[PDB]
Amino acid sequence: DRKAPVRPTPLDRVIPAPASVDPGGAPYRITRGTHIRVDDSREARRVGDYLADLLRPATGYRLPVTAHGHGGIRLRLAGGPYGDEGYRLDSGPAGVTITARKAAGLFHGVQTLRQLLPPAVEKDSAQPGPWLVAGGTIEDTPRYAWRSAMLDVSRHFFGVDEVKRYIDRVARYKYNKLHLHLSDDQGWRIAIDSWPRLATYGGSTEVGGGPGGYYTKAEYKEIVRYAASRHLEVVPEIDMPGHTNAALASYAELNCDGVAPPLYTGTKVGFSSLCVDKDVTYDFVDDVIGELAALTPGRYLHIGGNEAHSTPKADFVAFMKRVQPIVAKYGKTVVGWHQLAGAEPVEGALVQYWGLDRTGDAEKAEVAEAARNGTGLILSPADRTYLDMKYTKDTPLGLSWAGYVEVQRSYDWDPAGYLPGAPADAVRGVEAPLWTETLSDPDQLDYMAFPRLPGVAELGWSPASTHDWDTYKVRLAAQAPYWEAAGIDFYRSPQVPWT
Numbered sequence: 001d002r003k004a005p006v007r008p009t010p011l012d013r014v015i016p017a018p019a020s021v022d023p024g025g026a027p028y029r030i031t032r033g034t035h036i037r038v039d040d041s042r043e044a045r046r047v048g049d050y051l052a053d054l055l056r057p058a059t060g061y062r063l064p065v066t067a068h069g070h071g072g073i074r075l076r077l078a079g080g081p082y083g084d085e086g087y088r089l090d091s092g093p094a095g096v097t098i099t100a101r102k103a104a105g106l107f108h109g110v111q112t113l114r115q116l117l118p119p120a121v122e123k124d125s126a127q128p129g130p131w132l133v134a135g136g137t138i139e140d141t142p143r144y145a146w147r148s149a150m151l152d153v154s155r156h157f158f159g160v161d162e163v164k165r166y167i168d169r170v171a172r173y174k175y176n177k178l179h180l181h182l183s184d185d186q187g188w189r190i191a192i193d194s195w196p197r198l199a200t201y202g203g204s205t206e207v208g209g210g211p212g213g214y215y216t217k218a219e220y221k222e223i224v225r226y227a228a229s230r231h232l233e234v235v236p237e238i239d240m241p242g243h244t245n246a247a248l249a250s251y252a253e254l255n256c257d258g259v260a261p262p263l264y265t266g267t268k269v270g271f272s273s274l275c276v277d278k279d280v281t282y283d284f285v286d287d288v289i290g291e292l293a294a295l296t297p298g299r300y301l302h303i304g305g306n307e308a309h310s311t312p313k314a315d316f317v318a319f320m321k322r323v324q325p326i327v328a329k330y331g332k333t334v335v336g337w338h339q340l341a342g343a344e345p346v347e348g349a350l351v352q353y354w355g356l357d358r359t360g361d362a363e364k365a366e367v368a369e370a371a372r373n374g375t376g377l378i379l380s381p382a383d384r385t386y387l388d389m390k391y392t393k394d395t396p397l398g399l400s401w402a403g404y405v406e407v408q409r410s411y412d413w414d415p416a417g418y419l420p421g422a423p424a425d426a427v428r429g430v431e432a433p434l435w436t437e438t439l440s441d442p443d444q445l446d447y448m449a450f451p452r453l454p455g456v457a458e459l460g461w462s463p464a465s466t467h468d469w470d471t472y473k474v475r476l477a478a479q480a481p482y483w484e485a486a487g488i489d490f491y492r493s494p495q496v497p498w499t
């Protein structure tokens, strides 16, 4: 009875592990006449319609969303100790109620609810159910405010619909930020009016050659809108000064030797660099950042800064000293990979640490020092949360330069004491990056994203006290029938006792 359990799933059996779970009493049962009651507001109805859409196909029920009556499923905004993202979920024969201070909290509550329901909820046709929700109370709030997932759309391009699909994958686990790697050596994926060829030429191909692609302003705005409806703040990244071949290949004038390199379709890194000695370089950067900021309702702008191996240290420092201020000029908060820690991060900046266990002490120290100096830290270790890394030497996709990363390794650590010498309060959160040198279609993204994606979300959300591999793997194992029913391919790790 994997698909349709006789009894409801435990109230605590959800990912991320809720901060507080108190089971008790009988469960709630959704029946054909259940109404979804919300407050009389645009945002309230929005979360209501979202929930209704998730349930209607499998239940076959009408599930009307209204601001009147005592619906069996109630979503209500009210004062409480749940912050901007927390919520309380009460379940019993009298109905299910999700309470929170803001819509994001109600949305997160819904993500928990879909896990309390049986695997059959993932189907597209009416299912027998039963649509049981364990009885009790859940009070949930996040540990970290930065809980993101990154999708590399530069190595292999993924269109708007494919990005919306990935957005829905991550929304399941309460991630609240979507980092889009919009440019690299193999492609430039966002239209810039001031520099037209970046997209029309720089986005013409991808890894392996053939058709590439890019987002027009309208397409990008739609991705941002959709992400916002899933409560994901979009963090766009235009990598500089390295990983800039797409731009360099588009405008010869940007190159040091004034010669535009060919479009790149390989899978290596570190060979490209903007010419730090030319003034046109900074006009280019200013125009791009200004236009990107205009399309970014979010608070952050990622300027990358990684693997600029063709940029001498001194030039890299000079470059960053000059470009960082540009971000604030357009009202945004700068974010960069941890190499930025060696180039004097400006006030308010955040750096994304992608180091490994084996990374040298000197490098880790430079990052820890930045944290001491007030720089916020986003943790995404290459040997922990890089979803493109192989599980084992036999994995058919992905890379292995950072070693192999099985499910336990990806999950089994604590962000608070990860980077030696780094102040715990400097850690803003975590991120799970999905690089695409080896992934060209949505199904391949899923196989590399699952089952590690939920684990990283837990690290960003759950209390340290709830962290434990032996009990977590049981909760992860329970996701099997849901993913199977949803058509989400995933790596059946032998470390997990799959249900």
Ligand SMILES: CC(=O)N[C@@H]1[C@@H](O)[C@H](O)[C@@H](CO)O[C@H]1O
Pocket: 269, 306, 307, 337, 354, 382, 386, 388, 399, 435, 436, 437
């Ligand atoms: C921040 C950074 O260095 N990014 C690189 C990225 O260019 C590459 O696609 C990936 C392959 O796994 O390795 C990452 O470390």
Ligand SMILES: [Cl-]
Pocket: 168, 169, 486
């Ligand atoms: Cl999904």
Ligand SMILES: [Cl-]
Pocket: 266, 267, 268
């Ligand atoms: Cl190559």
Ligand SMILES: [Cl-]
Pocket: 267, 268, 269
């Ligand atoms: Cl390489």
